[PDB]
Design a protein around this ligand. Structure first.
Ligand SMILES: N[C@@H](Cc1c[nH]cn1)C(=O)Cc1ccc(OCc2ccccc2)cc1
Ligand SMILES: N[C@@H](Cc1c[nH]cn1)C(=O)Cc1ccc(OCc2ccccc2)cc1
Ligand SMILES: [Zn+2]
Ligand SMILES: [Zn+2]
Ligand SMILES: [Zn+2]
Ligand SMILES: [Zn+2]
Lengths: 432, 432
């Protein structure tokens, strides 16, 4: 598969090219506007059109009765595994809850930082085969931990089919309402609201091209997590690893999407060869290797470096969603590689564990977005409010400076709101 | 001016209406794509076209020499006031720096949360009269405090004119590079990079319709703070306030933009009348009341409630950028009003103080965005990376659950990356 050699005088050009990489807009714009202006009426319309479903009969909201039945149908070990994941995710996220900060500075000004949960959030969950209960837990649990009052999930049911495990996960994660809708129409319903779906304040959850374009439109009206990009895993490993294990980790990622990218960065060419052979073999032992195969062939890559000091700047440019570090003295590289959504350390930490039961959130920054964003955390479901309180002495002390800047900015009304107070106050400060 | 009465049987309908509220897209899409595909060449083109400037002569980058001269021209008291603001903003933001969190749970799994600064950020600063040095400090200081390696500012110079105070503030706030460009073309240059402007990882700073549309396009390629909306102030006050002071606070906000909104929520109609009279009078004592007057007439409003318990849900729906609370026992309402970008407490805390020297950031969530976002903080210039490390015992303990979920999701490659390790490992755990 694609192999880049840092040796190569053309390595940089090739590497930069490797790192690089429509009218749906028009269509989405109309769908979103129509749902906004018309409501439930437009939702059903678009739902029939895209999900071949008749919500007037199935109903838009999933019932607690339908959720109860999903639990029954589920294998006991599946429900228990989901509960273990829910518990581990909750405990870990609880630790990240922000603490308020109220204090008084040297001048006596009272400054404060207070956090509150967003009142209502909507989680978008793709339907059909891409419908994962693990994703429901990852997206919903932080909201529940944060204290979000109302957590809504929208999940389309093409041809009327919903994954029962998604309903099981939803309940476990504290999801309040569930609506059988998706696409740009569901995003529009959550942002603007309809007769059946009261609006929410933020929408999280990756979707297809129609969902992404709709999220771009509504951003500002509601908060949004980020626009989904192609998923990836960067594995930095030396020869002292089991080639079969590394190949398995690369293929796990690859089976997600035909556009998923798996990358091996190593300093041992022979080992790179061993991993490739393992990928080829496993590609045959496993079934349904249609997607994985396509992903590995079209986007897989090996990057050969002389040593791992060289791998550092390259790993930072890749800014992978998931980074597995399997080299000696692995801990020593963690601080050096600043751009990575999640880092998995050692041979016994396949990234897959993080997708499910580690505790950290698997909703991570993709497509180089790790250069500027973090994976989902309770902070994404909360907001900070600044608090400020000045007494007469404080205003007397900081007011002149404020007035000076306001006037230099030509904002006379701004200067006057301070001046009007100081003019009166000053008559008590003629001794200094 | 516009007065709403919660008494009114039609209050809710009127209030909801009061709370509500193009082809630029096509144009911006082309500008952004052209700058992306063509670089510096397109930047100059668009700069001549929109700023009537010839960058081939003035140069794109502002020189340290040009920055030095800006300092000289500035009044000593203006430079000192800006330094006081810079210092107060820095001290306050420093307190908000995140702390990493590495720990070991009961099963022995090592979980970690680590924070790093974004490597490079670009700050967009409008040109001409809307060019505020205070805004430069507010946008740049948190980045400097966060440890951002490269801080770039783009500020257009229509007809070749730049506000010297913007250059003064830039230096004080740790801005590294400054380019004389703006609009969708500057946003495109920062996101995709040109021969002269190396790309950045995140762009912050409100702009006009062209900038906002460009930011919506590049979101995902680079992080963005939020799309600017109309500015506002909500003042909740009882009769025990100086009507002139309250009027001044409303007008300070109003002078910002003809679309700025100032709102008085009170439980005393006579007092509301007194404030209105003060607004009218001050509207004549102050000069350049062209914008303020337009803002107050077109968007000003008084909301009359019976008591402040009633004001709470209304204030939460307004979700104001700035909220001044001037009533008895003010501190008691702070926790009750969860949606507000910044809260100013008491009669001696005009919001204007926060714009300048309080310490908190004046880049705040507007247009009801306080329902889901926070004002700018060091966290906006940093990102969290999750760390996970499992030993053989831990994988043996959590692996089965992972495998179970993976298989229930039909992700056999995912299950195999865990199974391949457990199969080998299990041969050491036949005693339990
Ligand atoms: N390792 C995964 C997490 C995980 C979930 N289940 C197994 N692994 C990850 O962190 C990235 C990721 C997240 C969501 C996701 O969405 C599923 C989807 C696929 C195709 C179309 C629509 C929706 C796709 C990728
Ligand atoms: N109170 C102000 C902060 C402040 C700055 N100087 C005085 N007050 C606030 O927090 C909100 C705000 C921030 C930036 C801003 O941008 C200036 C601008 C105006 C028109 C077109 C383009 C740019 C406009 C409003
Ligand atoms: Zn080297
Ligand atoms: Zn996965
Ligand atoms: Zn009441
Ligand atoms: Zn202001």
């Amino acid at each position: 598969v694609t192999t880049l050699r840092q040796t190569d005088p053309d390595f940089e050009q090739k590497f930069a090219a490797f790192l690089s990489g429509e009218d749906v807009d028009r269509a989405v714009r109309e769908i979103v506007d129509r749902v906004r202006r018309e409501g439930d009426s437009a939702l059903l319309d678009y739902s029939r059109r895209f999900d071949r479903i008749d919500l007037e009969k199935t109903g838009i909201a999933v019932t607690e009765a339908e959720i109860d039945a999903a639990f029954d149908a589920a294998p006991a070990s599946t429900v228990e595994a989901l509960k273990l994941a829910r518990d581990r995710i909750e405990k870990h996220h609880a630790r990240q809850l922000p603490k308020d900060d109220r204090y008084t500075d040297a001048l006596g000004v009272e400054l404060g930082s207070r956090w509150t949960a967003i009142e209502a959030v909507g989680l978008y969950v793709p339907g059909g085969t891409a419908s994962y209960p693990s994703s429901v837990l990852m997206n919903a649990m932080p909201a529940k931990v944060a204290g979000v009052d109302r957590i809504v999930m929208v999940v389309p049911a093409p041809d009327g089919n919903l994954n029962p495990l998604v309903l099981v996960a939803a309940r476990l994660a504290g999801v309040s309402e569930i609506y059988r809708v998706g696409g740009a129409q569901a995003i529009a319903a959550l942002a603007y609201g309809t007769e059946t779906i009261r609006p929410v304040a933020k929408i999280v959850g990756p979707g297809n091209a129609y969902v992404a374009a709709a999220k771009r439109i509504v951003f500002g009206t509601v908060g949004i997590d980020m626009i989904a990009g192609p998923s990836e895993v960067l594995i930095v490993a030396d020869k002292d690893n089991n080639p079969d294990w590394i190949a398995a980790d690369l293929l796990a990622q690859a089976e997600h999407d035909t556009a998923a990218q798996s990358i091996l960065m190593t300093n041992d060419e022979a080992f790179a060869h061993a991993v490739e052979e393992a990928v080829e073999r496993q590609l045959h032992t496993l079934a349904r290797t249609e997607t994985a195969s396509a992903s590995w062939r079209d986007f897989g890559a090996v990057i050969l470096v002389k040593d791992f000091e060289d791998a550092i700047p390259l790993a930072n440019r890749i800014a992978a969603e998931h980074l597995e570090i399997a080299v000696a003295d692995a801990e020593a590289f963690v601080p050096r590689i600043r751009n990575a959504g999640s880092i998995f350390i050692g041979g016994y930490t396949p990234e897959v564990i993080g997708d499910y039961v580690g505790g950290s959130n698997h909703v991570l920054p993709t497509a180089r977005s790790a250069r500027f964003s973090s994976g989902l955390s309770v902070l994404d479901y909360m907001k900070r409010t600044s608090l400020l309180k000045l007494g007469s002495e404080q205003l007397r002390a900081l007011g002149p400076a404020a007035i000076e800047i306001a006037r230099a900015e030509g904002l006379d009304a701004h200067a006057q709101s301070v001046a009007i107070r100081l003019n009166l106050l000053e008559h008590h400060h003629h001794h200094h």
